[PDB]
Symmetry: D2
Subunit: 265 residues, 4 copies
């Protein structure tokens, strides 16, 4: 297995991509501490991976809860090799014009506290452990960190902010801790309480690869960055992992639909 | 005079680069409304430019104050052609490890509310006027929106966020309103930080930082904004990001500039 | 006028964007030396701008012809302030699969010699003059220098290559000569002899600005970079000038078609 | 073994990073065809890996030789899953002013034919096989494809060109074939240049260049390529660009790394 003996801490790991990552990492022989809000989903995850996962109930916006998570990971598993700050909330792609005046302030805080501050706090909480292990941080970004229309101004700003975290923390924590970003997109899939695309169009206009991958197919990039001995030269790296959103064509996403007949293959 | 008849609103326009922009825009024949926290400095520019600049004291973090700045601009000059969200605060380049646990949450809010939310609220406030005029938004970013070591994680993350606002708002406001970013660097402004946060002068590290090999006066950074404010010149530009930082992103490994030996190598 | 007393040298200035630039620069009070292949179109341009333009007949692929151009500019006008290497040929957006085996080598040379080598030679020829004047270089790139589907692999590679020239030459020629790039796209409009989009689709899917600007509307960015006192802090700068191609949405180019009604404005 | 049953073709695979890739891919259970100019070194890897690696002597600039390498791969192993166009030559970091007028045209062709055209011809040669296998192209770029001072204008322009090939070919080959770039830096390979062209060792400038603060062994750069060759792990990736250069693009102004004082600051 790719990650035998490795210890990772994954925030927002009780569901979504984060849970797919927990499952993958454990299958790869890793031990995994998860910080998330749902006590029930966390206990379910602990039992699913008996002895290879530990769940910490808490608020990713709270430095104290991030520190509780780091501490619990160290208590259960003895070290932290790879930190994966991953918890994020969306903004329904709500356009600036559609953000009501009486909710915009609250919404700003909700989404930024989770998507950016929670990442800052995760890294802050885990810094002693990561320096000790000469480990690494793998941020979950998004296509919204690079291109428009993957979210409203709030979500897009937060994910661009994370690209800034990749760069500044790769600098600040060098030479001791490496810091990289995976920017998934085109996956299967919740926004703040203050706020409230067809597959055909998705395959034709958005995704050159011509299909929406299952969540599990997005876990491999994180295994790569977490693998002992495969990512040593990488810091400040940004891996767009979104089906080709940034390289899509003007009239169609892909240019090569006819190749198989074109090449008589 | 390249901006005759045009009207700009500039946030943080009473000091630093913002004030240089006010003077340049008035000099180019624009009328300018300014939102800023300094009453004294708003008075100074009002006296300097007479009726061609109007100031409004307020907090860039407040949508209400942003709406009052827009309302005032409309009352004074009848339209808004170019909005320059420009007000920003620094973080003293405070490293993550150096952000104290009891100050970090407040510092986050202070810097994000000014640098990111205040940009959002300025556009929100001016959107009706800007759609009416088929106008422009020129965001002030920073070298810190592209490269590390121009601020700590808080500042660097805010200016990266502003790059996101250029991209997303260029998309959301098209085809009516053009949205672009200028990213100044090497300005040597007095980088004010938040009260919650309690380094090497530019001159002292110049040859490690700026390929241009010199420290531009503030006036030297106003030309990029005039370009984006000039409808006959910048019509194709939206979603553009203009690094304007003396070459920080193209600096060499051992020294910033590669052409120290150029003139002797070519004689003359 | 914006450019009074300034001297520019523009390669590929006899037609297309290059001619629009000649015309604009002269209107702005600049003196302009033009290197191009057509003797007739050059003489026509000289007479159009009597005393403010000089035409040098030559091959942009030839260092000796680029040097002849620099020399003629100096002879006529006394200095070179701004060099604008701009001559380029297209590849018909010919896909790799459609490039015939017996023409690909020749085509590679044709397009690279013009689009990249001609730029290298222009800068090389003008280097003494530009260092003397503490001037600048403004490369014509293309949206093809940043995104796919603005050309085939040949044209796209050449224009990405030019981005490399912007970066390396901004470095190499600092602190004496500044080097920046304008990347136009969405304009009105020839490829190599070895080789051989609807407006509705262009406005809806490609161009957020929702219209194809006239060539003259692409000249302003070059005036900016050539203006004495407006671009001093800029070197290694890249100005995407393509109607928003890089910031286009997934299902439509623009997100704000409804704003005027939405805002009751 | 992460690549059991897969077949790779690697150009320039008989030395440097290319040979490290061959060894890693065989170690991961792939079979590998190599196109390279060194007959001796192709023999060395053939003996090393027995029947799991086959070499073909040839010129990466020649489409004919690229087609012969593909044909050979097919004859040996029955398919091509991953193509790694990797062969490149450097330019001694020769500055523009230092390119002699009588050598510059030849140098241009030599470096562009190898670094750019040879990449084009490798994909052209392997396209039928890659479309058949719904395979992958992993281009070797360089830090010189993103930042200055990693080569002269010739090399820097070629590796920037290769970034264009990642983008354009990701588009043209979708949805069947995925195309991505790895951009290694800090490798300390013996950067061979063209005969037409007649500097500071990495170790000597490390703290101005590499935030990671150490000089990776060649084997350390093979992991990114394995990832792109692993169908179960990299399926969503196309058009991606992975800088793999010890942090060259996130290096600080005064020193490459920002965390010299980190461990003392946190105790333990």
């Amino acid at each position: 297995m790719k990650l035998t003996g490795e210890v990772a801490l994954i925030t927002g790991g009780a569901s979504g991509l984060g849970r797919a990552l927990v499952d993958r990492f454990v299958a790869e022989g890793a031990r995994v501490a998860v910080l998330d809000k749902s006590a029930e989903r966390l206990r379910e995850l602990e039992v699913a991976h008996g002895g290879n996962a530990v769940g910490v109930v808490g608020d990713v916006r709270s430095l104290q809860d991030q520190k509780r998570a780091a501490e619990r990971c160290l208590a259960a598993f003895g070290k932290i090799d790879t930190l994966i700050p991953n918890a994020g909330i969306w903004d329904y792609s709500t356009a600036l014009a559609d953000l009501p005046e009486d909710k915009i302030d609250a919404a700003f805080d909700d989404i930024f506290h989770v998507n950016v501050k929670g990442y800052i706090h995760a890294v802050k909480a885990c810094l002693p452990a990561l320096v000790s292990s000469r480990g690494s941080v793998v941020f979950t970004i998004s296509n919204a960190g690079f291109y428009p229309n993957g979210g409203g101004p709030l979500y897009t700003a937060t994910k661009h902010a994370v690209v800034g975290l990749v760069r500044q923390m790769a600098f600040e924590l060098a030479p001791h801790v490496r810091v990289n970003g995976v920017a998934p997109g085109g996956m299967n899939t919740r926004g703040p309480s203050s706020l409230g695309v067809p597959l055909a169009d998705m395959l034709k206009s958005v995704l050159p690869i011509g299909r929406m991958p299952a969540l599990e197919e997005y876990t491999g990039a994180y295994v790569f960055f977490a693998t002992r001995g495969d990512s040593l030269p990488a810091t400040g790296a940004l891996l767009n992992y979104d089906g080709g959103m940034g390289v899509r064509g003007f009239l169609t996403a892909a240019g090569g639909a006819d190749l198989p007949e074109k090449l008589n293959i």
